[PDB]
Write a protein that binds this ligand. Structure first.
Ligand SMILES: Nc1ncnc2c1ncn2[C@@H]1O[C@H](COP(=O)(O)OP(=O)(O)OP(=O)(O)O)[C@@H](O)[C@H]1O
Ligand SMILES: Nc1ncnc2c1ncn2[C@@H]1O[C@H](COP(=O)(O)OP(=O)(O)O)[C@@H](O)[C@H]1O
Ligand SMILES: Nc1ncnc2c1ncn2[C@@H]1O[C@H](COP(=O)(O)OP(=O)(O)O)[C@@H](O)[C@H]1O
Ligand SMILES: Nc1ncnc2c1ncn2[C@@H]1O[C@H](COP(=O)(O)OP(=O)(O)O)[C@@H](O)[C@H]1O
Ligand SMILES: [Mg+2]
Ligand SMILES: [Mg+2]
Lengths: 69, 58, 116, 243, 397, 66, 398, 139
């Protein structure tokens, strides 16, 4: 399930994301990917039941940057 | 106390606005936010008592 | 339906239109007599003293709203409270009028003397 | 794989020692208990928290959510610019070092003297005089949280958003002590208050007074020092100009 | 298609002095209403007719299940599957059962679906959500063209627009001019635009739909355009029909680049209204009437000749129209012989129909103040400045 | 009261339209200057210098206005 | 003077004395009439409420139950970036409408060649596997479309755009019906042309006119249609449209009110699809595109040379043009044969063609007003007095 | 169950720790200003019988105006410190929200919370953010 990683917090790192079911979601462990780039806005594929970041997927667009080819 | 305990374990009923009593057995009712359904009426409730735009329980 | 406003002039013409709003009642600032009545309602629960002339107090309020009259009663009560008393006197009302109705004026005489 | 993730919400109220009224973001609100071992004293209203998705209990508190704009303004690297790389500012750089850093070193010195540590100072001069670089060097020497903020970038058409951004900036500063608020081009915010009545300058006054409250308002400031650089110091508001 | 609506009772309004001609006519009406009541109570008293098919209907009901959700048939596929949107907004690729009327399936008509495993199991031709059902006029307003004073050109124009095509239209195609699709009344407040709409809804032979303009806007995403579409679909279904949208400037303001989501939704709702206005041919028997006070603030695309040809002006009443309105509203009053009413009209002011009605009401109130009901001329004298609240004196002379 | 031991009466006597914020400034600046000079009791010199620094009121005004 | 509020005796005497003797009876009778009306209204009922039940013997209730217990529903979605599958990463992220978006894989029944970015796809509900692509289909019945092959508007039906119609002729007739001159001239025929002007000038029908005389089918596409409810799939729509443009021998593709598009995710998708269709399709073809707008809001990436070769301004009609339009619209109505249409065209300065048509409509309106089957010059005079102009010009100018 | 009437309030009060440490002694001078604030913000909250005996309604709400940095916000800080009332500190610019109708809703929420709580004090610093003289707004 796609989700925008809202940000990363410290506890050895945790995350908070915003899934496309308009729901914010805190993850004590950031799924099964690396944890350095992880931009606050990096769209990710997070599991649909246990809600951990199973994969990272390329960014969608920045609105007007798509408007210009 | 036991009766209240028993009745307190049953799920709540959705409120809805009846669009119109379609038939003597079916009633078109809109319930927020599921949408509109055509429900049936149980034995106790009389259809003629069901008027358009009245809050009913499902 | 009843509506209230401090600025009738800016209301929409389609709202002030009669049939939608009839009897555009105006509430002018109370005159001397009405001010005397307002003082007497708001001084009903006070502990007045013999020899109080509320008429003079009402005369001391040129163009004062009813809310200002109630504020004057409250300030007179406050003045009595300061001296840890329960009765209020005429001078209490006089200085209450002075305090409540106090407003900043045009300090510059030159500006004030533009008009004849 | 054994972690299930958690709701995030904000604590609204402490109903009792155990029952916490907690509102999930963009969702319903509940009354929920806290974990057996937790710092209930830090469960102040508004404290962002996590909720077990099944039992719906206070799981762990979270630091306050930060605005994306504030985050972006907060994570630009100062680049460890050294005090050698300034050039001929000895007396003024010493004064600025005093008024900012000394409260961050020996508050006991000031309290034995008896002064309250200074809240902040203005750095006015013509463009290209190095105010931005000077503040960056101050941050690099401090190696503390730096909020490089330019005033022209916070004015918005959205009516209540500029003052909201100022509130978020100062709330971030209060949360992340020691933080340095560098508000560049402050003449674009505090440009005197006047009653001509155009909407834009009126919103500017609202933002300025929000800044004034966040700066020397009811809530006293501790361990947060501000730097405001401008090229037109003479147009600053007297209320902001006041000590 | 079906037929129009808005049933009304007898005009009556031939006598008003309460001279038992009223009583006789009203007693006749009451007698007929009594025969209504008795006839239907007897028919329900004995009417045994049920069952018959039973088993096939019972098994089709079992197949349908309970409850059945209604959706909008957004699109159709090969004649076993379709695309249906639930009222939430989600649409699904579902199957179509045999017992559905394949001729009835069209994009837009409400479809009864199965609660579980959604599948088109029926068609509802009378969805008519409670809002749009409300906007449809049931009881005709008691006002009529007799109650309207003046505005003879306005009445002529509105009848030539919405009545002549409804009645014998052969003049239109005989001249070959397409009938005027839609008419916008406008003018200063309280000139009689809504009153004229009421009078049209009285002397009518078509489904009259009253709308508020601001009523169309709805909170939920896509609810606005969906409601506008439902309104116009009901208009076509019950054609001929007249769709009166009072206060069109509630949405008709100049279109500007939307920024927030809500303004985008408002733009969407107006775009859908304009699209629906364009959708039906002018040769169709559905007309719209839009009234407003701030005509100058309307989008100059809604009033295009290709969309709304006519533009009825409602100017402030003239002196003769003022006296007409005064006569109309003073009909039920027991005025004395001293009253003249000419002084009030001769006074150069900006009285409107609403203003004159209020003047009459206040004159009656003043008469009631003096414990009388004959209403002198002095009562009107006082009432005029009582209700008319608010050039520097001798500057112009 | 929190200041050091340290003519405050004359400074009060000086006619200057200054607010309580200015007084708090003056005192704070006096303490800051004493910290600069590394003396734990302010006196006439640094206190007066802070007083001048606080209430600048430098006109920089073209004399044709007066 | 303090006015006295009415007392109980005052109210009681007011309701009597000065009353009609029949007050009680009449008011009571009206009340019973209203009560009986509400009685009838509540008791008459609702009736069917007849669901869409097919006539019997068309029912396969056994097979219907089989489908109910066997077949499954699929939520539809707009598929998005392919994630560069290359047969090892076939997942795509799909947005199910106002619901969420999920990265999913294909069903075994569909090949990846059938799935591409931006097409509606029907998927299951738990695995969300794309089960079947759902092309939105093309038909003039839905939305509005070209709905025209040989328009009935000829060169005699257009006036006031002689220079404009000449320019349009050079645009479309010369390369289409005379490709030899462009070929031997060694010049690429005009790939793109834009027709800008105020609304109501006549622009659309002008193209339609040449569309009848270019021996090619006319295409009408409304930008608002691309931007209203028919957004999203519209790209694919025009895809299929452009596709059918390739199928036909010659297509006069024209987009109405491109301002709704030229000035927005799916809108940008439709735009870039148009860019691909134009810059991708060989300019030597025979489906030349006609562009028109009211607001010369067009993106700078569009009129770059190679996409819009020519620009044509459609100004307001002149005296000859306005009188031609008057005569054209009078040809379709019952008027006398001695109407000074030059007079009327003079009386309508800076008037749009649609305004002229409305003027003729109002002339017919006035003729109907007097119930005269033949409209007169007086009727047209009142019509122009009404429509046009929406003492000063006669007491100073003479 | 039923919750306290306004427990789920968006706007928060002054907790015990949030209370400032400024005392009435830390405010030099301003004897008459201190008295004129206490008579309406402190005395009625603790000596209501004093007002009832005189049969007067205590003053409710005070404006504090003057040149900047003369002690207004400090006097408010002290009042918050030296009071048993629930204190709602707000600032005028805080009221002006983005979304339409959210500002008035916040005002209503603040006053409703104060009403539903004990005798409470609403301090709105910089009231001229929102309470400037009304005029013919054209936007
Ligand atoms: N020509 C008229 N003759 C008699 N009464 C009139 C006339 N014009 C207006 N009125 C009276 O004015 C009242 C209000 O008029 P109406 O509701 O039509 O207003 P309007 O002009 O449409 O204004 P708005 O849309 O601004 O409310 C009517 O109830 C009617 O009694
Ligand atoms: N002491 C200094 N005074 C002025 N400019 C300087 C100084 N030190 C460095 N700079 C130059 O100033 C540039 C940075 O801009 P800066 O002058 O700091 O911004 P501002 O316009 O705020 O003064 C650097 O590239 C640097 O070369
Ligand atoms: N009467 C006073 N006693 C002590 N300190 C004062 C006094 N007046 C002002 N100050 C100093 O000036 C500042 C006054 O801030 P304040 O006057 O509350 O701001 P504003 O007037 O803008 O609300 C305080 O921080 C304090 O240090
Ligand atoms: N040159 C013309 N010849 C004939 N009719 C015209 C001409 N120009 C305008 N019209 C009239 O104007 C009306 C609207 O023109 P239309 O093509 O819809 O305007 P637009 O160019 O804005 O689309 C048509 O009904 C037509 O009768
Ligand atoms: Mg009206
Ligand atoms: Mg302050």
């Amino acid at each position: 399930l796609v989700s925008n990683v809202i940000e990363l917090l410290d506890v050895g790192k945790c995350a908070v994301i915003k899934t496309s079911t308009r729901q914010t979601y805190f993850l004590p462990v950031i799924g099964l990917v690396d944890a350095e780039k992880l931009k606050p806005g990096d769209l990710v594929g997070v599991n649909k039941d246990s809600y951990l970041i199973l994969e990272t997927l390329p960014t969608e667009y920045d609105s007007r940057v798509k408007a210009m080819e | 106390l036991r009766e209240e305990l028993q009745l307190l374990q049953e799920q709540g009923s959705y409120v809805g606005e009846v669009v119109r009593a379609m038939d003597k057995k079916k009633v078109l009712v809109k319930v927020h936010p599921e949408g509109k359904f055509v429900v049936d009426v149980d034995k106790n409730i009389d259809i003629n008592d069901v008027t358009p735009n009245c809050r009913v329980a499902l | 339906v009843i509506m209230a406003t401090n600025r009738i002039d800016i209301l929409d013409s389609a709202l002030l239109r009669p049939g939608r709003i009839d009897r555009k009642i105006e509430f002018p600032p109370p005159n001397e007599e009405a001010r005397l009545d307002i003082l007497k309602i708001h001084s009903r629960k006070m502990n007045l003293t013999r020899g109080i002339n509320l008429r003079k107090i009402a005369e001391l309020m040129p163009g004062a709203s009813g809310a200002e009259v109630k504020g004057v009663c409250t300030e007179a009560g406050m003045y009595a409270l300061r001296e840890r008393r329960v009765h209020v006197t005429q001078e209490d009302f006089e200085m209450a009028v002075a305090k409540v109705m106090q407003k900043d004026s045009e300090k510059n005489m030159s500006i004030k003397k533009l008009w004849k | 794989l054994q972690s299930v993730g958690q709701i995030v919400g904000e604590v609204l109220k402490q109903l009792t020692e155990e029952k916490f009224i907690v509102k999930a973001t963009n969702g319903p609100r509940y009354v929920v208990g806290c974990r057996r071992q937790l710092d209930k004293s830090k469960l102040k209203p508004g404290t962002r928290v996590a909720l077990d998705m099944t039992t719906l209990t206070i799981m762990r508190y979270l630091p306050r959510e930060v605005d994306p704009l504030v985050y972006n303004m907060s994570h630009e690297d100062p680049g460890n610019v050294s005090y050698s790389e300034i050039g001929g500012l000895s007396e003024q750089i010493r004064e600025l070092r005093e008024v900012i850093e000394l409260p961050l070193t020996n508050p006991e010195l000031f309290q034995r003297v008896g002064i309250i540590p200074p809240k902040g100072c203005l750095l006015y001069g013509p463009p290209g005089t190095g105010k931005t670089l000077l503040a960056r060097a101050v941050a690099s020497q401090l190696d503390c949280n730096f909020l490089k903020v330019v005033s022209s970038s916070i004015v918005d058409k959205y009516i209540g958003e500029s003052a909201r951004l100022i509130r978020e900036m100062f709330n971030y500063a209060r949360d992340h002590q020691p933080c340095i608020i560098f508000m560049d081009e402050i003449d674009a915010i505090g440009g005197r208050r006047f009653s001509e009545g155009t909407s834009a300058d009126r919103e500017i006054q609202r933002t300025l007074m929000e800044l004034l409250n966040q700066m020397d308002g009811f809530d006293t400031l501790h361990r947060v020092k501000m730097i405001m650089a401008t090229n037109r110091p003479d147009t600053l508001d007297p209320a902001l100009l006041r000590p | 298609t079906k037929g129009p609506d808005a049933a009304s009772k007898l005009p009556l309004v031939t006598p008003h002095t309460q001279c038992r001609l009223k009583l006789l006519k009203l007693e006749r009406i009451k007698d007929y209403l009594l025969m209504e009541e008795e006839f239907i109570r007897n028919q329900e008293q004995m009417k045994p007719l049920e069952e018959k098919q039973e088993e096939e209907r019972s098994k089709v009901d079992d197949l349908r299940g309970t409850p059945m959700s209604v959706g909008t048939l957004e699109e159709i596929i090969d004649d076993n599957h379709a695309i249906v949107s639930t009222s939430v907004g989600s649409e699904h690729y579902v199957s179509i059962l045999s017992f559905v009327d394949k001729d009835l399936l069209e994009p837009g008509c409400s479809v009864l679906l199965n609660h579980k495993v959604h599948a088109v199991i029926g068609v509802l031709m009378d969805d008519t959500d409670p809002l749009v059902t409300v906007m449809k006029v049931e009881k005709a307003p008691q006002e009529t063209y007799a109650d309207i004073g003046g505005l003879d050109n306005q009445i002529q124009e509105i009848k030539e627009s919405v009545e002549l095509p409804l009645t014998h239209p052969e003049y239109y195609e005989e001249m070959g001019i397409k009938p005027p699709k839609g008419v916008i009344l406008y003018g200063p407040p309280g000139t009689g635009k809504t009153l004229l709409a009421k009078a049209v809804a009285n002397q009518t032979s078509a489904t009259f739909l009253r709308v508020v303009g601001s009523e169309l806007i709805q909170k939920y995403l896509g609810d606005g355009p969906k409601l506008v579409r439902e309104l116009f679909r009901v208009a076509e279904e019950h054609a001929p029909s007249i769709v009166f949208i009072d206060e069109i400037d509630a949405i008709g303001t100049k279109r500007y680049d939307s920024n927030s989501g809500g303004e985008r939704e408002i733009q969407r709702t107006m775009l859908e209204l304009l699209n629906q206005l364009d959708g039906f041919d002018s040769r169709g028997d559905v007309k719209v009437i839009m009234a407003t006070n701030r005509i100058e603030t309307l989008d100059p695309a809604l009033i295009r000749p290709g969309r709304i040809d006519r533009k009825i002006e409602f100017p402030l009443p003239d002196e003769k129209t003022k006296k007409r309105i005064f006569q109309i509203h003073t009909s039920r009053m027991t005025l004395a012989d001293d009253v003249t009413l000419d002084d009030l009209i001769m006074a150069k002011d900006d009285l409107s129909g609403a203003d004159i009605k209020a003047i009459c009401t206040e004159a009656g109130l003043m008469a009631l103040r003096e414990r009388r009901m004959k209403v002198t001329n002095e009562d009107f004298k006082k009432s005029k400045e009582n209700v008319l609240y608010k050039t520097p004196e001798g500057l112009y002379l | 009261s929190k200041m050091n031991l340290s003519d405050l009466e004359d400074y009060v006597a000086r006619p200057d339209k200054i607010s309580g914020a200015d007084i708090n400034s003056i005192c704070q600046e006096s303490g800051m200057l004493a910290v600069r000079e590394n003396r734990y009791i302010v006196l006439a010199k640094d206190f007066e210098k802070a007083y001048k620094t606080v209430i600048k009121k430098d006109e920089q005004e073209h004399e044709f206005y007066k | 003077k303090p006015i006295r509020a009415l007392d109980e005796g005052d109210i009681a005497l007011l309701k009597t004395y000065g009353q009609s003797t029949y007050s009680r009876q009449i008011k009571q009778v009206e009340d019973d009439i209203q009560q009986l009306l509400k009685k009838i209204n509540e008791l008459t009922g609702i009736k069917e409420s007849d669901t869409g039940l097919a006539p019997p013997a068309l029912w396969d209730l056994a097979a219907d139950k089989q489908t109910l217990q066997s077949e499954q529903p699929l939520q539809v979605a707009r598929c998005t970036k392919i994630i560069n599958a290359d047969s090892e990463d076939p997942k795509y992220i799909i947005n199910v409408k106002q619901f969420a978006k999920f990265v999913v894989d294909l069903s075994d029944q569909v090949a990846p060649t059938d799935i591409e970015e931006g097409m509606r796809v029907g998927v299951d509900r738990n695995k969300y596997q794309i089960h079947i692509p759902l092309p939105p289909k093309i038909d003039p019945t839905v939305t509005m479309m070209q709905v025209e092959e040989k328009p009935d508007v000829t060169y005699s039906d257009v006036g006031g755009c002689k220079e404009q119609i000449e320019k349009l002729r050079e645009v479309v007739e010369t390369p289409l019906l005379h490709p030899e001159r462009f070929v031997n001239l060694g010049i690429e025929p005009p790939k793109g042309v834009l027709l800008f002007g105020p609304p109501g000038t006549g622009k659309t029908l002008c193209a339609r006119a040449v569309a009848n005389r270019t021996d090619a089918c006319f295409i009408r596409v409304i930008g608002s249609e691309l931007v209203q409810k028919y957004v999203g799939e519209g790209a694919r729509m025009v895809r299929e449209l452009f596709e059918m443009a390739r199928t036909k021998k010659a297509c006069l593709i024209f987009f109405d009110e491109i301002d709704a598009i030229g000035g927005d995710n799916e809108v940008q998708r439709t735009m870039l699809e148009l860019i691909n269709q134009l810059d991708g399709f060989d300019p030597r073809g025979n489906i030349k595109v006609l562009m028109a707008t009211n607001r010369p809001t067009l993106d700078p990436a569009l009129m770059r040379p190679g996409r819009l070769d020519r620009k044509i301004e459609f100004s307001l009609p002149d005296l000859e043009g306005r009188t031609h339009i008057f005569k054209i619209h009078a040809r379709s109505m019952s008027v006398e044969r001695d109407i000074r249409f030059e007079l009327l065209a003079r009386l309508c300065p800076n008037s749009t063609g649609a305004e002229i048509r409305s003027v003729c409509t109002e002339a017919g309106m006035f003729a109907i007003r007097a119930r005269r089957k033949i409209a007169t010059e007086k009727d047209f005079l009142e019509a122009v007095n009404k429509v046009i102009k929406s003492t000063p010009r006669y007491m100073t100018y003479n | 169950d039923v919750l306290p009437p306004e427990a789920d309030s968006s706007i928060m009060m002054l907790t015990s720790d949030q209370k400032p440490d400024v005392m009435y002694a830390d405010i030099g001078g301003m004897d008459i200003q201190k008295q004129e604030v206490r008579e309406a913000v402190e005395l009625p909250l603790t000596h209501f019988e004093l007002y009832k005996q005189i049969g007067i309604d205590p003053p409710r709400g005070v404006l504090m105006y003057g040149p900047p940095g003369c002690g207004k916000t400090m006097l408010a800080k002290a009042v918050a410190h030296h009071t048993t009332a629930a204190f709602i500190r707000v600032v005028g610019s805080e009221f002006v929200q983005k979304y339409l109708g959210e500002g008035p809703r916040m005002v209503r929420d603040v006053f409703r919370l104060a009403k539903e709580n004990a005798p409470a004090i609403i301090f709105i610093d910089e009231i001229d953010a929102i309470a400037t003289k009304r005029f013919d707004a054209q936007t």
